């Protein structure tokens with residue numbers, strides 16, 4: 001195979017123009033918030049075809065839609081690239097044309113939606129254009145999610161308001177069971193059992209789903225399964241509720257019930273790597289061996305993710321990190337940087353480095369995603385190398401991981417900084433592939449990374465945690481902000497957290513992100529299969545984090561040439577508390 005040399009040649013602008021436009025970008029976003037339409041229009045008038053312009057235009061359109069300025073809205077909406085239109089902007093545009101095409105899928109969402117989309121659904125409901133079953137499921141989901149005003153407004157649009165005498169008032173009164181606080185009460189199940197006979201099938205099913213969901217996410221597995229067992233129509237459940245029913249069944253090793261629950265999930269959820277793999281494990285455990293193999297093949301086909309790897313291992317396939325494509329040609333790598341949109345991203349990236357401007361760097365990321373948005377796989381792999389060469393490490397990974405068939409593992413799983421990471425890992429006796437896997441997920445190798453809550457650097461150590469580490473290993477807490485000190489702190493904390501959690505690497509990974517006390521709370525009174533512990537982590541961020549860090553670690557270990565450790569063995573057994 002050759003990679004194609006075809007690269008885009010979009011109009012380029014001088015560095016001066018890119019930097020001038022960025023100079024005005026924060027003020028343009030402020031002008032949207034201040035409803036200074038003349039200022040926003042002036043910023044966009046001579047903007048390049050950039051992510052800056054797209055972002056300002058999208059934010060402007062949300063404001064124009066909220067203010068029902070439809071002539072100007074329609075004019076600016078048409079200027080967006082279709083794949084660049086924000087969800088809420090699309091909802092406003094369709095609503096302005098009385099087109100409720102999107103409502104049939106949007107109403108399946110049981111949580112907060114942007115205002116334009118929330119209103120699209122209310123308008124569809126008032127015109128009788130919503131499926132009633134789905135609409136009331138959304139009302140219930142909003143009630144259980146403390147979106148009470150949105151629930152009230154949708155019920156009113158359905159013709160049954162909360163202060164009416166009918167269905168809406170009954171749904172609203174059920175907050176004494178399904179409220180965020182009510183559902184935790186020791187008497188919630190007794191209260192629901194007393195009123196059950198007066199509830200509809202759908203109200204009963206949803207309310208038992210709320211109580212089961214709370215118990216399951218609290219890891220009270222027997223009670224969770226008792227409550228979920230009372231759900232007569234499982235399709236009434238929110239997606240989170242039915243996934244937490246599956247998680248309780250998985251954790252209890254109820255393979256039949258797990259398969260039954262998965263069969264009631266939306267098709268989208270059934271076809272996820274998670275539930276393809278665990279349904280396959282259920283079929284294996286019940287002696288449905290050929291069907292297990294079929295499901296493992298489907299899970300393995302979903303990509304490079306945690307469950308695709310575990311599914312491959314059940315088929316006898318181990319990770320193989322050789323590339324199945326050649327390197328991009330160097331002339332194409334050079335010409336890619338000449339494309340106007342790629343150049344703009346590289347200009348903002350390089351100037352963010354030289355000027356120490358973290359906000360400019362974030363907009364450089366946005367320009368990169370914008371520039372590469374439509375790219376076929378050959379262009380993605382070419383642009384990934386362009387990014388890597390310029391030191392734009394997170395965007396090298398971003399572009400390389402977006403392919404489906406053409407795999408360059410050296411750009412998906414970059415490993416800069418080995419002259420620092422490897423020795424710090426060795427010094428505390430921790431697996432370097434695990435450290436690289438953790439860095440990839442934490443920062444994507446961005447030296448200056450800072451999360452919204454203040455986690456800092458390559459290894460995303462919190463200032464309060466850095467303070468404690470510094471006091472234990474003879475450092476100044478400000479070394480958190482240097483690459484070498486950050487890696488020393490993060491590796492030491494991986495090792496210390498592991499020591500505190502029965503020396504288990506799965507617990508340590510969870511504890512790094514959620515705190516050691518959380519990781520320990522999530523253990524059971526008996527041992528847990530490692531992937532079962534991971535899939536039943538109550539915090540969605542940490543659950544996703546553990547699977548991504550451990551899958552990354554498996555790829556790094558293969559690239560590093562370490563003795564082979566199957567991912568299922570890396571997950572191993574999480575000990576009883």
Ligand SMILES: CC(=O)N[C@@H]1[C@@H](O)[C@H](O[C@@H]2O[C@H](CO)[C@@H](O[C@@H]3O[C@H](CO)[C@@H](O[C@@H]4O[C@H](CO)[C@@H](O)[C@H](O)[C@H]4NC(C)=O)[C@H](O)[C@H]3NC(C)=O)[C@H](O)[C@H]2NC(C)=O)[C@@H](CO)O[C@@H]1O
Pocket residue numbers: 451453455459460461462463464465466468493511512513514515516517518541
């Ligand atoms: C929004 C979001 O999720 N951002 C995450 C960010 O949370 C991740 O950072 C991790 O956060 C967790 C949760 O706060 C940190 O856990 C705490 O860690 C400290 C230090 O180990 C624990 O305090 C100590 O507890 C012992 C036991 O009782 C006491 O003896 C000590 O006195 C006490 N020390 C101090 C200084 O108080 C604390 O209990 C943990 N919290 C909980 C709830 O268990 C964790 O350290 C932190 N990780 C790092 C590497 O800093 C971040 C990284 O994944 O990602 C996101 O930005």
Ligand SMILES: CC(=O)N[C@@H]1[C@@H](O)[C@H](O)[C@@H](CO)O[C@H]1O
Pocket residue numbers: 441442443449450451452455460513541544545
């Ligand atoms: C810069 C930033 O926000 N990085 C976060 C990190 O803080 C978090 O621990 C991790 C969890 O998946 O996800 C990364 O994207």
